[PDB]
Structure formats: structure tokens, C-alpha cells
Ligand binder design. Structure first.
Ligand SMILES: [Ca+2]
Ligand SMILES: [Ca+2]
Ligand SMILES: [Mg+2]
Ligand SMILES: [Mg+2]
Ligand SMILES: [Mg+2]
Length: 611
């Protein structure tokens, strides 16, 4: 079968790789670092934190809060699975990461920042989060420009977090409730998504009455104030219906844009009213046995296939709901096994039932090219380079196959290969249920400390110009950092020479003339300096300190410096052949990687050798 515990452990871990902001010292990876550190600076509010949505760096609060609410729902339903697998700390840290950010997004009563980053600008650059150079604007809703869905989705996240944190951190639970109440009030009074516009084209909302009910249900569970339960039920007639019927919609599934499925499931458990039981069973039946002659499509290999986008996201989310409902005493007895069989079949399809895993870094032949900027780690603003991902973003569930099980693992294949917060949300809960039922031990003390697979800072050089009394070098430093990607503003390199022939000529080695084209306004080439005069070794120091060299573009990641060292005009004793840094030097202005012109990062040699 499959190791569900390991799968669960990695799915939770996926979110740690999505983190924006000031990362914890207790971090268990060596390729993510501080990023989005000025988030909210444009409005004077600290909005750092939260999770990047998918393979991009925009913080879209609707999917983000849907995600944390779903993870909290799983912890609420299956704490015993989390405790037994030893993953409780990790999922709670994830839930708190998202919710600490939503709290920051509600700086004052009635104001809610729902996004940080501009989709257009963010998506136009392909590089690691740590070195983003573009503006990252903050967007907000308030009484005048409402966002009922995003406010209520966030209230649901906060309230569900309060439910699962109440026992261990009652104060934080109260903090979450305070903000949840404010955002729900905003949403409920407004009943409009008219001011929620910055996510247009990415996460535009098509409904908010579902979010209102979902939020109200969670606020009821968090506060035990039945005022919220009444509100939750009051919005039901306003939920979307199946076309030309008065029947609550049942042909889609729980997802960031439609949470009435989870709301009605919860309402059935909380009230035992037939309306809700019938509604959730209609949805679950449509997804399994079919209902009234209608049924979700199934691929030949057994994937319940809803839509071309995020098919696995949908199937595994429905698997979670089927698992939760199947365990409830109110579930029609004959359907319990049907629903539990569906949970297993859909999860197993994601884990490996077709012969390969659709979970990054897990199982057999997992996806190698998810559409994800930071895991790929390009240093040249190119989706195509490197031709492999520098990092393994463990746990990420890819979009999924087409309706015939077709799947292409390529970085530019969004339909099959995008990865996102919401894709792993329901999946995580379904995995907890499978772990509870079939086991599979998580990897003990699992960390994502990767080996550095490419020299992070290198230098290429070649002979630019030459003569009987001089040598001119063309050198290019490249920032190829990835563990973590980072700005290298304290780089320098040294070019070593043996000037024994200068001393022999009766000339002061320090009198030779050095000179320098060069990319980078701060490029400074020194005069000849002593290094090991007992062996007649001198050098030229080239300092690039101050240069904003970063792994985010062809020009951004490199600095070219051309420099020359010259003996007096008319002389012929200059001998570059006994110079340490000249040995092997490429004979033209077409540079190549050299190991004898060492590169230093803040005075520490990081590439190459010294004499
Ligand atoms: Ca909605
Ligand atoms: Ca020499
Ligand atoms: Mg820090
Ligand atoms: Mg490949
Ligand atoms: Mg020598």
C-alpha cells in the first residue's frame, strides 16, 4: 500500500516552503530565507508573513485562508492522527503562520488587507522569493469597498484556528476569535465582494453566502454563541442552486471559491437536520455512486475528475469530506463503506495507484518539474534554466491529469503541474484519515537540508587584451546562489601574479599600472598589492562590495570587470606565465570558469584557490 504518515508529514511540510516573511530560526530547510520583508510598507502596516499562493509570490488571502481553515478542520477532526504521527507541532505551526498574518491584515477594526503583491508584476519575473525586486502593493477592503468572501473566509480560518488552539494556547485562541469576529462582521454587514478586486483574474470570487455560512459555523464552534449558528443557517437559501431546481448545488466540490460543501457537512453534524444531510450526501453521492442519473466523470484509472484545473486538488478535497462524513453517526449506514472506499481510492491515486506519485518528493517517480519559482531556483529569470529544479518542494500535490489520465511533468504545464496552497489543503486532511486507518510511519526527524548542487558564486575569465608589457583580464562574477538564493553585495576577487621579473628589473612591483570596462558602478580595481613577497607574489584586488548582485536575471546575477596590469612601455620582461592566476586562463575575451582567481564573500574565500 502507501505510507500515509510520510505523505501527511510532507504535505504539512509543503507549506513551510511557501512561507513569506521573517522565517524561524527553528526552520528545517536551508533553501528558504527571509522574503517579502517590506510587505505592507506602502501602507505603513507590518503585513509580513503568510504563505505565497502557488508557484508565485503573491499573497492571495482568499485561497490562503481557505487553506488554513481546511488544515484546522483536519486537526479538529483528527487530532489523534496528528499526535500519533508526531506531526501535531508542524501542522499547528502552519496554521499559526497563516493566522498570525491574517491578524496583521486586520490592523484596526473594520479594515482588512486581503492581498500583498500584484499578479501582473509578480508573475512577470521568474526567480526566488528572497530576491524579489518589484513593488509589492497592499490592497484592502473596508465598509466602503467590501470583500465579504475574503473577510468571511479569513474569519473561518481564524475561528477554526481558535478551536484547535484553545486547549494549548487559550490566549491565542481568544486573539483569533477577536479578529474573526471583526472580519465576519465586515462580511455580514456588507454582503458584497464589490471591493475585492486586486485578485481579478486569479481569485475573483463567484460567491460569498457560502463563506458567510462557513465562517458562521466556525465562529459558533469557537465561541459557542448560537447567534452564529442561526446566521449560518440563514444564508442557506442564498447558496447557489443546481440550475432550474431549488436544490442546493451538489455537482462541484469544496474549494477556495465554494465552501458550502464544508459548511453543510458541518451543519449536518451540528444540527442533524435532514436538509444538510441530504445536501452533503447528494454531493458525495454525485462523486461516488452517482445520483439521479448524474455522476462526476471518472478517468479510466479511477480518478474522480471534476475539471481540467487542479483535478487532484478536487478529488482529494472531496476524499477528505467523504472521510469526515463517513465517520459521523448520521451518515446513511449503507454509504459509509462507499465513502470510505472513495477516500482511499482518490488518495491512493494521488500517492501512486497509477504507478507513479503525484506528490513532489514522495513515492515512486514523483513530479520533478512543478511550476514553482523558488523550488526551481533560476538565477537568470528563465523558466528553462536550470533544466532541473534546484530544490525539492516536498509534499506538493500537482494539479493532476486530464480526464484520460494524461499527465506531462513540465515546468510550463500549469494544468497538470501547478502546485498551490489550496491544492494541499483538503489533501492533508484526507491523508490524516488514511494514516489513522492504515498507518505508514513518517520519516523520523525529517528535514529538508539539501546538499549544495552548484557552486553558489563563481567567476569566469579570459584574456581580454595583451602585450609585451601587460596583461588585460576580462572577468565575470556570477551569483548562482540557491541555499538560500541571496543578494551578494560583499563579493570581491583577487588576481595573483609573480612579479619576480619586475624586482629583477630594478622596478618596484607596487609601481606597475593597473587600470579598468566593467558592469556595476561600484567596481573598484586596486593597484598592485603585496600578498607573499617572499615568493614575489602580488595581487590586484577587485571589489564589488555594494553591487546589488542577485540571482534574478542575466544581468542581475553577474558583474563583468576588465582590468589590466602593465609594466613600463617599451619593456619586455613582463612574464604572465609564472603568474598563478594566468595559468590556464582562456586565451580570448570569451570567458570560461576559472579556479585560480579566487572569489571572496565578505572576505571569506568561497570559490577558487589561492597561491
Ligand atoms: Ca465563495
Ligand atoms: Ca610574472
Ligand atoms: Mg529572523
Ligand atoms: Mg526532467
Ligand atoms: Mg612564483
Amino acid at each position: 500500500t502507501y505510507n500515509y504518515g510520510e505523505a501527511l508529514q510532507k504535505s504539512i511540510m509543503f507549506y513551510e516552503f511557501q512561507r513569506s516573511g521573517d522565517l524561524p530560526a527553528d526552520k528545517r530547510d536551508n533553501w528558504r530565507d527571509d522574503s517579502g520583508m517590506k510587505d505592507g510598507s506602502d501602507v505603513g502596516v507590518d503585513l509580513t508573513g503568510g504563505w505565497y499562493d502557488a508557484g508565485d509570490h503573491v499573497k492571495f488571502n482568499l485561497p490562503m485562508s481557505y487553506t488554513s481553515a481546511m488544515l484546522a478542520w483536519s486537526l479538529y477532526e483528527d487530532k489523534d492522527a496528528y499526535d500519533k504521527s508526531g506531526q501535531t507541532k508542524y501542522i499547528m505551526d502552519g496554521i499559526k503562520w497563516a493566522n498570525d498574518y491574517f491578524i496583521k491584515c486586520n490592523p484596526t477594526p473594520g479594515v482588512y488587507y486581503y492581498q500583498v503583491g500584484d499578479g501582473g508584476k509578480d508573475h512577470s519575473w521568474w526567480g526566488p522569493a528572497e530576491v524579489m525586486q518589484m513593488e509589492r502593493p497592499s490592497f484592502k477592503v473596508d465598509a466602503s469597498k467590501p470583500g465579504s468572501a475574503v473577510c468571511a473566509s479569513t474569519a473561518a480560518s481564524l475561528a477554526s484556528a481558535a478551536v484547535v488552539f484553545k486547549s494549548s494556547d487559550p490566549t491565542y485562541a481568544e486573539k483569533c476569535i477577536s479578529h474573526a469576529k471583526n472580519l465576519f462582521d465586515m462580511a455580514d454587514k456588507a454582503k458584497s465582494d464589490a471591493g475585492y478586486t486586486a485578485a481579478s483574474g486569479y481569485y475573483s470570487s463567484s460567491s460569498f453566502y457560502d463563506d458567510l455560512s462557513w465562517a458562521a459555523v466556525w465562529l459558533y464552534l469557537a465561541t459557542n454563541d448560537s447567534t452564529y449558528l442561526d446566521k449560518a443557517e440563514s444564508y442557506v437559501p442564498n447558496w447557489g442552486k443546481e440550475q432550474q431546481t431549488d436544490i442546493i448545488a451538489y455537482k462541484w466540490g469544496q474549494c477556495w471559491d465554494d465552501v458550502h460543501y464544508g459548511a453543510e457537512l458541518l451543519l449536518a453534524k451540528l444540527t442533524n437536520k435532514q436538509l444538510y444531510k441530504d445536501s452533503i450526501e447528494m454531493n458525495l453521492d454525485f462523486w461516488t455512486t452517482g445520483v439521479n442519473g448524474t455522476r462526476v466523470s471518472y478517468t479510466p484509472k479511477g480518478l474522480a475528475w471534476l475539471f481540467q484545473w487542479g483535478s487532484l486538488r478536487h478529488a482529494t478535497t472531496q476524499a477528505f469530506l467523504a472521510g469526515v462524513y463517513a465517520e459521523w453517526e448520521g451518515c446513511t449506514p449503507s454509504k459509509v463503506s462507499v465513502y470510505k472506499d472513495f477516500l482511499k481510492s482518490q488518495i491512493d491515486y494521488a500517492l501512486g495507484s497509477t504507478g507513479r506519485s503525484f506528490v513532489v518528493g514522495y513515492g515512486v517517480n514523483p513530479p520533478q518539474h512543478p511550476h514553482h519559482r523558488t523550488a526551481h531556483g533560476s538565477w537568470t529569470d528563465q523558466m528553462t534554466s536550470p533544466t532541473y529544479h534546484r530544490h525539492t518542494i516536498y509534499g506538493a500535490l500537482v494539479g493532476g491529469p486530464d480526464n484520460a489520465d494524461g499527465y506531462t511533468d513540465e515546468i510550463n504545464n500549469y494544468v497538470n503541474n501547478e502546485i498551490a496552497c489550496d491544492y494541499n489543503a483538503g489533501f492533508t486532511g484526507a491523508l490524516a484519515k488514511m494514516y489513522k486507518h492504515s498507518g505508514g510511519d513518517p520519516i523520523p526527524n525529517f528535514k529538508a537540508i539539501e546538499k549544495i548542487t552548484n557552486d553558489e558564486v563563481i567567476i569566469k575569465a579570459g584574456l581580454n587584451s595583451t602585450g609585451p608589457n601587460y596583461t588585460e583580464i576580462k572577468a565575470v562574477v556570477y551569483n548562482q546562489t540557491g541555499w538560500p538564493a541571496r543578494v551578494t553585495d560583499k563579493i570581491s576577487f583577487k588576481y595573483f601574479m609573480d612579479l619576480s621579473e619586475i624586482v629583477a628589473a630594478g622596478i618596484d612591483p607596487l609601481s606597475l599600472v593597473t587600470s579598468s570596462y566593467s558592469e556595476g558602478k561600484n567596481t573598484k580595481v586596486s593597484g598592485v598589492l603585496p600578498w607573499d613577497v617572499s615568493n614575489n607574489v602580488y595581487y590586484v584586488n577587485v571589489d564589488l562590495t555594494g553591487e546589488n548582485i542577485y540571482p534574478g536575471g542575466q544581468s542581475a546575477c553577474r558583474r563583468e570587470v576588465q582590468f589590466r596590469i602593465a609594466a613600463p612601455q617599451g619593456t619586455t620582461y613582463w612574464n604572465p606565465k609564472n603568474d598563478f592566476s594566468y595559468d590556464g586562463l582562456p586565451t580570448t575575451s570569451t570567458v570560461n570558469t576559472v579556479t585560480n582567481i579566487p572569489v571572496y564573500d565578505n572576505g571569506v574565500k568561497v570559490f577558487g584557490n589561492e597561491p
